Amino acid sequence: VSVSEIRKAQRAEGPATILAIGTANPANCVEQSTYPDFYFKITNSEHKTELKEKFQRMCDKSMIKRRYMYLTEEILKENPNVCEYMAPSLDARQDMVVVEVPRLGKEAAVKAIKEWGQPKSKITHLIVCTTSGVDMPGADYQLTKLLGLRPYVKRYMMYQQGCFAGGTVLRLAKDLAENNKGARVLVVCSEVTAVTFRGPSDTHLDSLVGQALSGDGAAALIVGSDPVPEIEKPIFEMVWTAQTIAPDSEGAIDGHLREAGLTFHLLKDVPGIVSKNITKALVEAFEPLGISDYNSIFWIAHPGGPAILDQVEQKLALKPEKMNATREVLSEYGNMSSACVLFILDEMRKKSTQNGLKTTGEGLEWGVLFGFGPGLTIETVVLRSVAI
């Protein structure tokens, strides 16, 4: 047997391509304007007047209009330990998210598979990503069962990676599709804030900021190399990826999964660190392609909050429209952790197509997607748009 012949026959030929994108969110829509009142009432903290005033300013500066939350008033009434700042509550949270993560992921995945239009039996690989709970068999097994994928789908279960993982799933899917002839990868990012929701405390304002920004949602992709012309429909091509840890960022974003659930700790200035390291990431990605004008490419940036976006724009002198797609998803959905960047790709290609632009990347050829999260980690994905 010839391994060289096997290897040649086994691998794909072209760039990994996104062929479908579908999203889903819990039905419960929570207005941001009235959130301070709701959140302080439900967590029994109405007497904490100065703290409530700080939270009101956080929500007012968030640039989020609404979020979709699995947690409702009724669910929170049955779970006082989840409403406390710090009470034993992981079992309750896990019971919620071990079911909700695959439920919500299934809705997105069905939408993506419908768009793709090919039999779900042709899905060869499955990547599932969540920072909302863990279980064995994982959410990948649950989604294989729920969707009726083949039992021999090759699964990649990415748990507890955080806000920068929408880039990580793209980086992974690229190698799976590109090294395997005929591979078609279903990618599902599904994030639910029931694991992090908790009451307010005036000595932990970093935890409070997350209560103003995080929301729920799932997004699913079909990724494959060598699309079948006119049967399959390329949306974006992946060309190069990177992951790096910013200097002087130790403890910028920590998250510990404990008996009281997942709690986040912000010990450094995240917008400052991202802004100070974004140029280096751009020159690694785009110097090899000969491009140095960062207004000439299309942009997708994880909106961990609005000042990350504001400080990046100011650092680079981006035109205000560059972050439009990113800001539209922040406004309508909040920070949905790993799924957020995939919602932004969907928004960008939909607006580009609806408005008759020349490519799915706002009429431009090359683009960049960033994820930002614990480490401090920056994920970079270089993309090429598709005509029409």
Query: What amino acid positions are annotated as catalytic residues?
Result: 163
Q: Identify the CA nearest to 366 among candidates 276, 280, 290.
A: 290
Task: Determine the Cα–Cα distance for residues 132 and 97; give it in Å rounded to an integer.
Answer: 6
**Binding status of residue 229 toward a copy of itself by CB under 8 A:** no
10 Å CB burial of residue 46 (0-12, 13-18, 19+) is exposed
Residues 278-307 that bind a copy of itself (CB under 8 A): 289-290
As measured in angstroms, the least distance from the Cβ of 84 to a copy of itself is: 15
Closer CB to a copy of itself, 237 or 347, in the complex: 237
Q: Between 14 and 33, how does the x/- string for binding to a copy of itself read (CB under 8 A)?
A: xx------------------
**Binding status of residue 254 toward a copy of itself by CB under 8 A:** yes
Residues 179-218 that bind a copy of itself (CB under 8 A): 179-180
Task: Determine the Cα–Cα distance for residues 21 and 120; give it in Å rounded to an integer.
Answer: 15
**Binding status of residue 100 toward a copy of itself by CB under 8 A:** no
The token pair at 49 is 């007047």
Task: Determine the Cα–Cα distance for residues 367 and 224; give it in Å rounded to an integer.
Answer: 19
As measured in angstroms, the least distance from the Cβ of 7 to a copy of itself is: 6
Task: Determine the Cα–Cα distance for residues 107 and 92; give it in Å rounded to an integer.
Answer: 23
Closer CB to a copy of itself, 106 or 111, in the complex: 106
Numbered residues of the known binding site for substrate:
196, 215-216
Residues 318-377 that bind a copy of itself (CB under 8 A): 366, 374-375, 377
Residue 254's Cα: distance from chain center in Å? 17
Task: Determine the Cα–Cα distance for residues 297 and 318; give it in Å rounded to an integer.
Answer: 10
CB 68 within 8 A of CB 333: yes
Closer CB to a copy of itself, 62 or 249, in the complex: 249
Instruction: Choose one: 23-31, 159-167, 312-320, 334-342; the region binding a copy of itself (CB under 8 A).
Output: 159-167
**285: amino acid identity, one letter:** A
Closer CB to a copy of itself, 162 or 271, in the complex: 162
Closer CB to a copy of itself, 306 or 374, in the complex: 374
**Binding status of residue 111 toward a copy of itself by CB under 8 A:** no
Q: Which of 134, 266, 307, 316 binds a copy of itself (CB under 8 A)?
A: 134
As measured in angstroms, the least distance from the Cβ of 349 to a copy of itself is: 18
10 Å CB burial of residue 104 (0-12, 13-18, 19+) is buried
Task: Determine the Cα–Cα distance for residues 268 and 290; give it in Å rounded to an integer.
Answer: 34
Numbered residues of the known binding site:
54-61, 196, 215-216, 307
As measured in angstroms, the least distance from the Cβ of 240 to a copy of itself is: 7
CB 194 within 8 A of CB 132: yes
Q: Which of 40, 76, 178, 327 binds a copy of itself (CB under 8 A)?
A: 178
Q: Identify the CA nearest to 143 among candidates 177, 176, 190.
A: 190
Closer CB to a copy of itself, 37 or 248, in the complex: 248
Q: Identify the CA nearest to 333 among candidates 320, 346, 351, 319.
A: 346
Q: Identify the CA nearest to 127 among candidates 18, 44, 210.
A: 18
3-state SS, 214-276, equals ECCEEEEEEEECCCCECCECCCEEEEEEEEEECCCCCCCCEEEEECCEEEEECCCCHHHHHHH
Number of residues forming the site for a copy of itself (CB under 8 A): 65
Closer CB to a copy of itself, 322 or 384, in the complex: 384
**Binding status of residue 243 toward a copy of itself by CB under 8 A:** yes
Instruction: Choose one: 24-32, 70-78, 144-152, 330-338; the region binding a copy of itself (CB under 8 A).
Output: 144-152
* Backbone phi, psi, residue 22, to 5°: -140, 145
**Binding status of residue 85 toward a copy of itself by CB under 8 A:** no
Q: Which of 31, 37, 60, 91 binds a copy of itself (CB under 8 A)?
A: 91
As measured in angstroms, the least distance from the Cβ of 262 to a copy of itself is: 8
DSSP 83: H
Query: Binding residues for a copy of itself, per CB under 8 A?
Result: 1, 3-4, 6-7, 10-11, 14-15, 88, 90-91, 94, 131, 134-138, 141, 144, 151-162, 171-172, 174-176, 178-180, 237, 239-247, 253-259, 289-290, 366, 374-375, 377, 384
